[PDB]
Short mmCIF file of C-alpha atoms in Angstrom, two decimals:
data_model
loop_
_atom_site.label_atom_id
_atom_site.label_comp_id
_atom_site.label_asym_id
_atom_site.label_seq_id
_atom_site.Cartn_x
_atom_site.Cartn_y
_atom_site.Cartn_z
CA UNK A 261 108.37 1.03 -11.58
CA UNK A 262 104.85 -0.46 -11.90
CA UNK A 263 101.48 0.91 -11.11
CA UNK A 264 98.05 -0.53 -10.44
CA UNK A 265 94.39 0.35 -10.66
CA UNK A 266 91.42 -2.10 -9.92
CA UNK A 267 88.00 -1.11 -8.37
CA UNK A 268 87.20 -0.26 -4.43
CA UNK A 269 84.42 -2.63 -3.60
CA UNK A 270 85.11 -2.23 0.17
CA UNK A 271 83.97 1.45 0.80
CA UNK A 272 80.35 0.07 -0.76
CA UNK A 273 79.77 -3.26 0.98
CA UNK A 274 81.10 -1.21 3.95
CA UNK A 275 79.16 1.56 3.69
CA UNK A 276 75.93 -0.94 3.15
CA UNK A 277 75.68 -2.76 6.28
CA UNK A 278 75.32 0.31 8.28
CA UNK A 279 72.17 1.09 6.32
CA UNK A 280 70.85 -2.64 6.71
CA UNK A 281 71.53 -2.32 10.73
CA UNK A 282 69.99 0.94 11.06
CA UNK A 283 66.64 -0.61 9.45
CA UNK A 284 66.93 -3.72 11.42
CA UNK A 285 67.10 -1.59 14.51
CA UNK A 286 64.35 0.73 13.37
CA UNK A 287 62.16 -2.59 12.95
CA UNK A 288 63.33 -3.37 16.83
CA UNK A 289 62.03 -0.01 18.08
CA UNK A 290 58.70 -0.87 16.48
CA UNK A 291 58.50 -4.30 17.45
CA UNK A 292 58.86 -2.87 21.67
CA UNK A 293 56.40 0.28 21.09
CA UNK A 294 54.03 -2.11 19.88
CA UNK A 295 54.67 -5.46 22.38
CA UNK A 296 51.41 -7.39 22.66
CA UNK A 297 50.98 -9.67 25.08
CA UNK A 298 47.79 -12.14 26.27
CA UNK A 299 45.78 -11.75 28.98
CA UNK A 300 43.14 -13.52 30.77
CA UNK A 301 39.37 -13.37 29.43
CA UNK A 302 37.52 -10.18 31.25
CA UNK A 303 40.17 -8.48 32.27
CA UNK A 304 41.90 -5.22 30.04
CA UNK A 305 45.30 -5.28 28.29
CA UNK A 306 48.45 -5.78 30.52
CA UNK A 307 50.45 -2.89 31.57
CA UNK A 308 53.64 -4.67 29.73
CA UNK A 309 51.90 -3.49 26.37
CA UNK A 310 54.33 -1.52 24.20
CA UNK A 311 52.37 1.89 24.50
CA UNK A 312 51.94 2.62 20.83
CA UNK A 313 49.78 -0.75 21.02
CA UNK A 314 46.98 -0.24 18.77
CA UNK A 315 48.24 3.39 17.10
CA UNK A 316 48.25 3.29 13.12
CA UNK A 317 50.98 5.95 12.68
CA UNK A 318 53.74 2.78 13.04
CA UNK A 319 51.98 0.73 10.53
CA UNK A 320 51.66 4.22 8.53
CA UNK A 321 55.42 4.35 8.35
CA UNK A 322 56.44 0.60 8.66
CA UNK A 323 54.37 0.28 5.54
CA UNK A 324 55.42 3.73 3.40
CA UNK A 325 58.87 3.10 3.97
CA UNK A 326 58.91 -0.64 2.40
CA UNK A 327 57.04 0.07 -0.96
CA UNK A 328 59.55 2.70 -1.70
CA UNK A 329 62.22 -0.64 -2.10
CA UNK A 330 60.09 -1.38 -5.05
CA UNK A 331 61.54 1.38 -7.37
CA UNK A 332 59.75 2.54 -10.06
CA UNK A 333 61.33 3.64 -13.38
CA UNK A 334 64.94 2.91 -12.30
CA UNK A 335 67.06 2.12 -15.28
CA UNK A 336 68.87 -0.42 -13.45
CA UNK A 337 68.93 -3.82 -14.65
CA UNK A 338 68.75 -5.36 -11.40
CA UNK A 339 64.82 -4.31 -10.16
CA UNK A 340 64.90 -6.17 -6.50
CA UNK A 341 67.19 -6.54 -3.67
CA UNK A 342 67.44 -10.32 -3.82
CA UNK A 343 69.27 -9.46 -7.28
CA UNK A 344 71.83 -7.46 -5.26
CA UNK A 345 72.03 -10.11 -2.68
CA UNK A 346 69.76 -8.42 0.27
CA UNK A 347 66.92 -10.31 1.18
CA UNK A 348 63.75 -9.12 3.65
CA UNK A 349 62.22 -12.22 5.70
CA UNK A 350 59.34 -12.33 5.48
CA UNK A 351 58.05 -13.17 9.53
CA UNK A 352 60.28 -10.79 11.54
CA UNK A 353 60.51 -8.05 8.29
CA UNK A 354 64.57 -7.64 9.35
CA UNK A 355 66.91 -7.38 6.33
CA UNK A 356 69.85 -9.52 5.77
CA UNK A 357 72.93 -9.93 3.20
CA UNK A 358 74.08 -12.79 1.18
CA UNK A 359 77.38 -11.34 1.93
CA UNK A 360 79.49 -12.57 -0.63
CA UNK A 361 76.94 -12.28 -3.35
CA UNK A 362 77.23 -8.94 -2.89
CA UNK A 363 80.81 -9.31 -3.23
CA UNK A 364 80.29 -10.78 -6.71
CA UNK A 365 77.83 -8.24 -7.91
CA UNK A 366 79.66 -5.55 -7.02
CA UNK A 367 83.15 -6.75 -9.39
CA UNK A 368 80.15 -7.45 -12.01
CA UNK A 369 77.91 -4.81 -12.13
CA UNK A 370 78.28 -1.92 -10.17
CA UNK A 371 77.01 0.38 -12.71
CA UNK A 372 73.31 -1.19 -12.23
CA UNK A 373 73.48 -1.24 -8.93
CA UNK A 374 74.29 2.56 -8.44
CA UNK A 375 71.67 3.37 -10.91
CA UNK A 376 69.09 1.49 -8.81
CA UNK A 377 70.22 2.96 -5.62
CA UNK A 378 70.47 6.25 -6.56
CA UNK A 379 71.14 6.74 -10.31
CA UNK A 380 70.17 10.28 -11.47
CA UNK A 381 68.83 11.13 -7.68
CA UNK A 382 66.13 13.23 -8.94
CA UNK A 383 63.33 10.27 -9.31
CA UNK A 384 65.35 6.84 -9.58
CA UNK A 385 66.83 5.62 -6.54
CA UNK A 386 65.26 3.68 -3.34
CA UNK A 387 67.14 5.99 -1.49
CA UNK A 388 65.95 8.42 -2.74
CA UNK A 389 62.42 7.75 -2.50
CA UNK A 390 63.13 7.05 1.07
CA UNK A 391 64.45 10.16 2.63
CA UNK A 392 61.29 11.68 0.44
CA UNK A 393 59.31 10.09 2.29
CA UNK A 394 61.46 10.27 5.64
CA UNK A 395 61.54 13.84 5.74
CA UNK A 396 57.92 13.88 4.96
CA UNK A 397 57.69 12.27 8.43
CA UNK A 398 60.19 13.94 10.29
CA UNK A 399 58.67 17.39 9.45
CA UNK A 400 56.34 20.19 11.21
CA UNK A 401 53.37 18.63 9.06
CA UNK A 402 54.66 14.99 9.35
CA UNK A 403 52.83 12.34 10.52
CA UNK A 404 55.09 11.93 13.43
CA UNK A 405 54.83 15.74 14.24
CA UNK A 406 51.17 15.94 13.69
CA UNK A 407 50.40 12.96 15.79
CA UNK A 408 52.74 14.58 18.47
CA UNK A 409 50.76 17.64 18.07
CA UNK A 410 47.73 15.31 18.49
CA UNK A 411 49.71 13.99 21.21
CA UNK A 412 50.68 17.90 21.75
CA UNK A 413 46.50 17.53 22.24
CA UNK A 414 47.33 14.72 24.27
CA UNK A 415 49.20 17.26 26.50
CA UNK A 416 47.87 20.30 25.89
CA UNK B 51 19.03 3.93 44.67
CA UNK B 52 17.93 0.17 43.39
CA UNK B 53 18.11 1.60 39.80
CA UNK B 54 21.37 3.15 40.21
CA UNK B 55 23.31 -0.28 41.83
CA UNK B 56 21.91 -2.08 38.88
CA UNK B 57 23.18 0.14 37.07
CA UNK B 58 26.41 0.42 38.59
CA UNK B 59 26.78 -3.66 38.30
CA UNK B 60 25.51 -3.70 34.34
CA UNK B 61 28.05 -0.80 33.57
CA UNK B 62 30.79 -2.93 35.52
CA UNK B 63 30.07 -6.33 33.67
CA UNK B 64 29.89 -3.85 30.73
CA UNK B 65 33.32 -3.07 31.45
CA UNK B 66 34.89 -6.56 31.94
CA UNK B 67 33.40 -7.33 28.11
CA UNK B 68 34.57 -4.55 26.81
CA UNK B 69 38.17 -6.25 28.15
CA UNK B 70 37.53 -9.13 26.37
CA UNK B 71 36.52 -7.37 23.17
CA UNK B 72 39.68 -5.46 23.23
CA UNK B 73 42.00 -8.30 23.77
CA UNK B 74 40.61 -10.46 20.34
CA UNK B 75 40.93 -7.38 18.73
CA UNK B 76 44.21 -7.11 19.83
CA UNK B 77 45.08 -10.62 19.05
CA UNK B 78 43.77 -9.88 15.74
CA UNK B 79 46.41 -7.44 15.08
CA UNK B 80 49.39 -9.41 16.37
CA UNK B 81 48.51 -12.40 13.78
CA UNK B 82 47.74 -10.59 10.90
CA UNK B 83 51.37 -8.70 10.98
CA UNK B 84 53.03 -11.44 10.80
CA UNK B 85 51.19 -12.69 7.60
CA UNK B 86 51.30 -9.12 5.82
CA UNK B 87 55.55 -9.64 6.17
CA UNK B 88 54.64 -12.98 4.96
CA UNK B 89 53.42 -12.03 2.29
CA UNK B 90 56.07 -8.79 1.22
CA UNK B 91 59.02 -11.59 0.89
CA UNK B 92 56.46 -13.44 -1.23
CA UNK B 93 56.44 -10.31 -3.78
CA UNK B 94 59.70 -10.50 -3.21
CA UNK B 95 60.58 -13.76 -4.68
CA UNK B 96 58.43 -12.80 -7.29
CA UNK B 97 59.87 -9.74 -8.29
CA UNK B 98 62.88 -11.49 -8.06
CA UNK B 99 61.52 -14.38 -10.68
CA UNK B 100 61.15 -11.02 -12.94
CA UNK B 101 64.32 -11.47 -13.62
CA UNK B 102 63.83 -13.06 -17.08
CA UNK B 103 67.70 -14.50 -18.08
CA UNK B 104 67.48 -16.61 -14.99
CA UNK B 105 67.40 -20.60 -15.18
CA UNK B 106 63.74 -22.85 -15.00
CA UNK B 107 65.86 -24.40 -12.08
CA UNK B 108 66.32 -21.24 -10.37
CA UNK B 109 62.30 -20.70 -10.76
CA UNK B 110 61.55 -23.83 -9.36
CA UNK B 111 64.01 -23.31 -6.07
CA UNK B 112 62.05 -19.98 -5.83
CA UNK B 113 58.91 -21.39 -6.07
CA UNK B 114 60.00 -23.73 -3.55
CA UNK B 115 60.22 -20.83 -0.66
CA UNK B 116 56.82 -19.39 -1.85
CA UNK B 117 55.43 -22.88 -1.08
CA UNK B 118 57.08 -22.84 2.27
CA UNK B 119 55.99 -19.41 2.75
CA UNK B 120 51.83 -20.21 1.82
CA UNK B 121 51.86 -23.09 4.23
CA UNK B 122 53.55 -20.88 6.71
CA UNK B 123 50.57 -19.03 6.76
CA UNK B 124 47.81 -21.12 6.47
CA UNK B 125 49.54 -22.37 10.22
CA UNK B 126 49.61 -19.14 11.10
CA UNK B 127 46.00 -18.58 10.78
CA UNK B 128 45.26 -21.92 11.77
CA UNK B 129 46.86 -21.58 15.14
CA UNK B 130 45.56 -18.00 16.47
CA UNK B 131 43.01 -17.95 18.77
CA UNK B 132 41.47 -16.43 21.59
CA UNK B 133 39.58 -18.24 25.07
CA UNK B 134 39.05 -20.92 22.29
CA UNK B 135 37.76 -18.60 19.49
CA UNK B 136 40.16 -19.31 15.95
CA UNK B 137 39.69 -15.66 15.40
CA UNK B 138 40.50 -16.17 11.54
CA UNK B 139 38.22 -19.68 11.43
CA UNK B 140 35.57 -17.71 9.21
CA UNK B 141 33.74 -15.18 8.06
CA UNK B 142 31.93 -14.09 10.70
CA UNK B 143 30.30 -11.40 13.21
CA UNK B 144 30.46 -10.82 17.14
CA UNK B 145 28.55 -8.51 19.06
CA UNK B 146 29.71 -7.41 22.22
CA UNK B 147 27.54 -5.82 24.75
CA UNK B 148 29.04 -2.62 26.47
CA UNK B 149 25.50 -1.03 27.70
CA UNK B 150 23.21 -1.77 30.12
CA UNK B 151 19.92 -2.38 28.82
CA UNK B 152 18.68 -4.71 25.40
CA UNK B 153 20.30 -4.19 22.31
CA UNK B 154 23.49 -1.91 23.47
CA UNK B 155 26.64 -3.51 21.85
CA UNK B 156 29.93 -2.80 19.32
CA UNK B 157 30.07 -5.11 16.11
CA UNK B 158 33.16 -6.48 15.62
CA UNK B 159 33.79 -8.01 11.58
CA UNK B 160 36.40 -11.28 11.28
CA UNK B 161 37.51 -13.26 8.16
CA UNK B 162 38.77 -16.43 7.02
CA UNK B 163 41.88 -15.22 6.18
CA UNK B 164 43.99 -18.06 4.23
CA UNK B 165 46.07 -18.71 1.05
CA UNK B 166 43.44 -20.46 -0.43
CA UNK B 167 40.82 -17.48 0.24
CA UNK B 168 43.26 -14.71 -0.99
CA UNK B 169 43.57 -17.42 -3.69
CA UNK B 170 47.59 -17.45 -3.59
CA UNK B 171 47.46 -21.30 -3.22
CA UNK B 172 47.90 -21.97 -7.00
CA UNK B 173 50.41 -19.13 -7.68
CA UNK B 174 53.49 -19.99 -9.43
CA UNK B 175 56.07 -19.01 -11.45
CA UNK B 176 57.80 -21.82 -13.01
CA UNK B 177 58.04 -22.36 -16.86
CA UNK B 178 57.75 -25.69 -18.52
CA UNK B 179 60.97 -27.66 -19.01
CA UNK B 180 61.76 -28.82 -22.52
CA UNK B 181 61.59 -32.95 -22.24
CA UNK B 182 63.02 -35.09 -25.02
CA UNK B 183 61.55 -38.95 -24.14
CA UNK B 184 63.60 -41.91 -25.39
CA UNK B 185 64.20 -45.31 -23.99
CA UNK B 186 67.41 -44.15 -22.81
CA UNK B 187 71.00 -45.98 -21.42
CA UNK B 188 69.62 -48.35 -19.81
CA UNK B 189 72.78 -49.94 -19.29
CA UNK B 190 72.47 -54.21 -17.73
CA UNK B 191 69.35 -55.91 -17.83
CA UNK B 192 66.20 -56.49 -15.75
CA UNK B 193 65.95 -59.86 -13.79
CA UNK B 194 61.85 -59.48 -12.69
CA UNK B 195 60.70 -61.87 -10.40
CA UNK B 196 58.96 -63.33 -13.35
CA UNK B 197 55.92 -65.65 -12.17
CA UNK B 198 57.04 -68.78 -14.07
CA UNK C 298 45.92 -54.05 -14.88
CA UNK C 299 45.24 -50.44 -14.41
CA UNK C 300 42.63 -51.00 -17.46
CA UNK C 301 44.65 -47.88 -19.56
CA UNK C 302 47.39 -49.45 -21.70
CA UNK C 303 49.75 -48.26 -24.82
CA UNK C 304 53.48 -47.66 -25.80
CA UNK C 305 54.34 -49.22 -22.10
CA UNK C 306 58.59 -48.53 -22.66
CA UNK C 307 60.82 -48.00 -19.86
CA UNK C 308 62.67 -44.47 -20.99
CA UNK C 309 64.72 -42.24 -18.83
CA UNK C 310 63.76 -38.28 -19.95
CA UNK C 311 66.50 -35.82 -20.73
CA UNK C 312 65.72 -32.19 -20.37
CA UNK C 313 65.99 -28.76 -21.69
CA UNK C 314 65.66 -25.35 -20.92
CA UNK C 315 65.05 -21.83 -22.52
CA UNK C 316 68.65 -21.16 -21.90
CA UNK C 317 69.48 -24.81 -23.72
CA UNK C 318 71.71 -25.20 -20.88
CA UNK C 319 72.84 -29.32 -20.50
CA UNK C 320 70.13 -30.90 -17.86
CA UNK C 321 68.64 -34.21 -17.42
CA UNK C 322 65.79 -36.06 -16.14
CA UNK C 323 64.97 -39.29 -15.05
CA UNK C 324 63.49 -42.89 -14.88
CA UNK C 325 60.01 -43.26 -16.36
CA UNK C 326 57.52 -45.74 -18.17
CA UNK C 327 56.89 -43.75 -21.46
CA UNK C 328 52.84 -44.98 -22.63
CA UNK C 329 52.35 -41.91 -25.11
CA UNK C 330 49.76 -39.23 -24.09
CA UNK C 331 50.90 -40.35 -20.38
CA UNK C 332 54.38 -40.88 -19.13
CA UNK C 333 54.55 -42.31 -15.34
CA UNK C 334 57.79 -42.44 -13.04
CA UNK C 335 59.31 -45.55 -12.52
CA UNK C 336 61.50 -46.88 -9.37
CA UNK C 337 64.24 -49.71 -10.41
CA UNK C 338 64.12 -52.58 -8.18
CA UNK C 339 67.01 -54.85 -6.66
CA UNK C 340 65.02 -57.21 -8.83
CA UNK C 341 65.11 -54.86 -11.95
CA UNK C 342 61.62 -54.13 -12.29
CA UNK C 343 61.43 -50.69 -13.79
CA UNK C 344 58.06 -50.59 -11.41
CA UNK C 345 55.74 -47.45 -12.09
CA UNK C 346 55.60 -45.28 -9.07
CA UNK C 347 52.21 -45.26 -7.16
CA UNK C 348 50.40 -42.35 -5.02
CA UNK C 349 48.39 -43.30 -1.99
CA UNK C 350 45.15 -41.56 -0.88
CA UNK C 351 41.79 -41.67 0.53
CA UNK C 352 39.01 -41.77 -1.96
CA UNK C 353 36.51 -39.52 -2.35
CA UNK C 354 33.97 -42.30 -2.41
CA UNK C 355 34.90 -43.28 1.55
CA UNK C 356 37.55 -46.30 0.61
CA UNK C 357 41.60 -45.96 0.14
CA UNK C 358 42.90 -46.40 -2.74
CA UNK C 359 46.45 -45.50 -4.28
CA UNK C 360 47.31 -44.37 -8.45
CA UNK C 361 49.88 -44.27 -10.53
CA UNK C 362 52.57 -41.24 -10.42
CA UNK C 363 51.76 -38.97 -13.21
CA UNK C 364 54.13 -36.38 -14.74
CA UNK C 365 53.30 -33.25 -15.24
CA UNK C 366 52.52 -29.89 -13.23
CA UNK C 367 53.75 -26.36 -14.15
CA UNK C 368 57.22 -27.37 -14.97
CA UNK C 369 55.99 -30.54 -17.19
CA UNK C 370 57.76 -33.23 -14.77
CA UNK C 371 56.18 -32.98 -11.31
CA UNK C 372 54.45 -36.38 -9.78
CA UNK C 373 50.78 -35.52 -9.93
CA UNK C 374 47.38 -38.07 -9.56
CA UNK C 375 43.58 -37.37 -11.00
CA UNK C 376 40.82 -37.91 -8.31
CA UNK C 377 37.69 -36.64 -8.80
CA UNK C 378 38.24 -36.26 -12.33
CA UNK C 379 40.82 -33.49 -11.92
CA UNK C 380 45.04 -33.40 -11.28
CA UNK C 381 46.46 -33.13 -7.64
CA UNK C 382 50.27 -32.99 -6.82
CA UNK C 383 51.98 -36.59 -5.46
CA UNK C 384 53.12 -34.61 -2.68
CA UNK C 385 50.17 -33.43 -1.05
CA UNK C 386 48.24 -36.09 -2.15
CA UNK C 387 49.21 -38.33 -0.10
CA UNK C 388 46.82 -39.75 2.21
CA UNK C 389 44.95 -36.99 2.30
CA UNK C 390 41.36 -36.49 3.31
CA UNK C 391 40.11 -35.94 -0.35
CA UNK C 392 36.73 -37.12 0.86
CA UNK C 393 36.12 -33.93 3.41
CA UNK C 394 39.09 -31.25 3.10
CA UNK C 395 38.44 -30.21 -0.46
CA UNK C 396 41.29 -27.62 0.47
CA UNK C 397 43.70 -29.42 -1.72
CA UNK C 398 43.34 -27.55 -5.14
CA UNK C 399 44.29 -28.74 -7.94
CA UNK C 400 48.29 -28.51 -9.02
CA UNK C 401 48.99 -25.30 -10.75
CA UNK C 402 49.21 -26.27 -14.38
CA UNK C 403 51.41 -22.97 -16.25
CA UNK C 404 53.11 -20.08 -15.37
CA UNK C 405 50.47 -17.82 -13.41
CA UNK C 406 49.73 -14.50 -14.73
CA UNK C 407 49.58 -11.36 -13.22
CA UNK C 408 50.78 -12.90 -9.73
CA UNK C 409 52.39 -9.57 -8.86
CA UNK C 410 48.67 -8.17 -9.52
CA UNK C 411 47.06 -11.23 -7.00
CA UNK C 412 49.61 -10.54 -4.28
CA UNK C 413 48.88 -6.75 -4.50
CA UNK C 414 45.24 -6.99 -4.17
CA UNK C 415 45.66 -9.49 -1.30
CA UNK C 416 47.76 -6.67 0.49
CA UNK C 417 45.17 -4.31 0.17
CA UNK C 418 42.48 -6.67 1.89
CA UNK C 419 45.20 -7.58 4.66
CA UNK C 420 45.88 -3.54 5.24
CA UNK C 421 42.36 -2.66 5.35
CA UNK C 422 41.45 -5.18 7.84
CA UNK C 423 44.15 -4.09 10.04
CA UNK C 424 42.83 -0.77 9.67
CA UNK C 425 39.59 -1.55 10.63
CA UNK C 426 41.03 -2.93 13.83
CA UNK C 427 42.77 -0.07 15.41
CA UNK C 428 39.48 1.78 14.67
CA UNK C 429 37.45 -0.45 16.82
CA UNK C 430 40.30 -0.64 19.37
CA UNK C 431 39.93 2.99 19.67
CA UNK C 432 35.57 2.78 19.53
CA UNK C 433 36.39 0.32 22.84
CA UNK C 434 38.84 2.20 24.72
CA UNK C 435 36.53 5.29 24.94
CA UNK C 436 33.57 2.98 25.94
CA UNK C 437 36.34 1.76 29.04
CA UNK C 438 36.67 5.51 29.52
CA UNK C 439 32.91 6.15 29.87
CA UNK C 440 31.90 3.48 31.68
CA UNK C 441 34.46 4.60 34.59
CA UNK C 442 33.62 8.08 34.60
CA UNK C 443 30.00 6.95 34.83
CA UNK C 444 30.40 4.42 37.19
CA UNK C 445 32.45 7.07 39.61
CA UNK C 446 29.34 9.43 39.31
#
């Protein structure tokens, strides 16, 4: 009676595609708190403005959370998504997957690709770096609490 | 009461130009988003050249989205503008008056934003091809419209 | 007739990489120091490819196809006394637009450096925008208050 063991690819790809749509709806939520939209000359901004129009905190995070893709000191062969087969465009900033790509490099390589993800997860890892600098947000100090303490001003 | 109702009408024509300044700056803002994401794919693609065991041909289809990309931007900044202002046409200065008397006005600073003044027009990545030059099969003959 | 002449052959160039991997390249009339692309004909002329432009001395005019460019085998013409890529080339206003730089001629160094520092300028402007949305709003906010009193 015969037995077989391969790899589980499935769980990964699976469990990567929630990650990509939370980011892609993250991007949505700042694209409609910041909404622009024309006006005619001499008269102020229309009320249809996303209300965070003009605020820097949602450039302050749009922008800290993207270098952290850009690993540093990861052993990982692979240094970029595109290697993995995820790819950021670069007019809306949404993420997408060269699905089957994936596919590939996952049978090939998985070893390099958990390394860059999350490897040791002391240092290496974009991950990693991320919730770093995700909790640094969420917290009592973090931007977003300290601009809703300014906004905290803004109320109290 | 003849100083305060010219007051009152400066400080309301004041206002209205204050509008205006706030819109370009707005506009401003909208445009140069889209050419910052522009330009994270492009250090993207070349991070993604960094991969060293990949193929000259693989450069050169890369290189061939950064192209795509650069003009991509140079329409970009070509096309915004504001009540006929191309806000990223030039260097260049406004002053808009917010008081009510000479001389009372916020400075605004614009630039002429573009691949070829970041100077990422001649950026590239590819590496030259090895080319071996013979006369090659040329298999038939040529029949020129010879002027006899 | 051009008035430059040499080893005028009609060659087709084979190619190479770093990898050695099996590639090929094309049609071309091989002179020496210059190798042009070449078209064949229904009539079998091996004819050298030509690029059409606007001179910069006010007239059109139109030049042979020149290899060369980063990779070696790009289509690229001199005017002005410096090399231009076929492709944008073409009929462009040479004589005006100086815009069109010249084709990039190696690999580019440091581009990861070039694109970084162009960030940098593009975030700091956009920084200095929200400031000066913020200078205007309070002005909005004082000239109402001070137009109520």
């Amino acid at each position: 009676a015969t037995v077989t063991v391969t790899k589980d690819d499935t769980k990964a790809k699976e469990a990567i595609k929630s990650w990509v749509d939370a980011y892609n709806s993250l991007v949505d939520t700042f694209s409609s708190l910041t909404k622009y939209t024309a006006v005619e000359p001499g008269e102020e901004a229309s009320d249809k403005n996303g209300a965070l129009l003009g605020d820097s905190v949602v450039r302050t995070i749009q922008t800290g959370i993207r270098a952290q893709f850009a690993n540093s000191g990861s052993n990982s062969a692979f240094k970029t998504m595109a290697e993995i087969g995820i790819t950021q465009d670069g007019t809306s900033g949404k993420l997408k997957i060269d699905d089957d790509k994936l596919t590939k490099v996952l049978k090939d390589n998985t070893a390099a690709a958990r390394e860059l993800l999350v490897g040791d997860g002391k240092e290496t890892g974009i991950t990693t770096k991320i919730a770093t600098e995700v909790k640094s947000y969420l917290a009592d100090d973090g931007i977003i609490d300290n601009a809703q303490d300014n906004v905290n001003a803004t109320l109290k | 009461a003849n100083r305060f109702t010219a007051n009152i009408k400066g400080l309301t024509q004041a206002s209205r130009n204050a509008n205006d300044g706030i819109s370009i700056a707005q506009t401003t803002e909208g445009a140069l988003n889209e050419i910052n994401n522009n330009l994270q794919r492009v250090r993207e693609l070349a991070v993604q050249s960094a991969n060293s065991t990949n193929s000259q041909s693989d450069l050169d289809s890369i290189q061939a989205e950064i192209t795509q990309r650069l003009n991509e931007i140079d329409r970009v900044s070509g096309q915004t503008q504001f009540n006929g202002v191309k806000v990223l046409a030039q260097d260049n200065t406004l002053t808009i008056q917010v008081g009510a008397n000479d001389g009372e006005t916020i400075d605004i600073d614009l630039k002429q934003i573009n691949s070829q003044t970041l100077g990422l027009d001649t950026l590239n990545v590819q590496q030259k091809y090895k080319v071996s030059d013979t006369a090659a099969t040329v298999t038939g003959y040529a029949d020129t419209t010879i002027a006899l | 007739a051009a008035g430059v002449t040499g080893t005028a052959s009609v060659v087709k160039m084979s190619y190479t990489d770093n990898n050695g991997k099996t590639i090929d390249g094309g049609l071309a009339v091989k002179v020496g120091d210059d190798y042009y692309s070449a078209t064949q004909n229904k009539d079998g002329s091996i004819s050298i490819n030509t690029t059409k432009y606007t001179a910069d001395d006010g007239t059109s005019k139109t030049a042979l196809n020149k290899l060369g460019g980063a990779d070696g085998k790009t289509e690229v013409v001199s005017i002005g006394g410096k090399t231009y890529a076929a492709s944008k080339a073409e009929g462009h206003n040479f004589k005006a637009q100086p815009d069109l730089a010249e084709a990039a001629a190696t690999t580019t160094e440091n581009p990861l450096q070039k694109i970084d520092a162009a960030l940098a300028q593009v975030d700091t402007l956009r920084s200095d925008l929200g400031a000066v949305q913020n200078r205007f709003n309070s002005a909005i906010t004082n000239l109402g208050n001070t137009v109520n009193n």
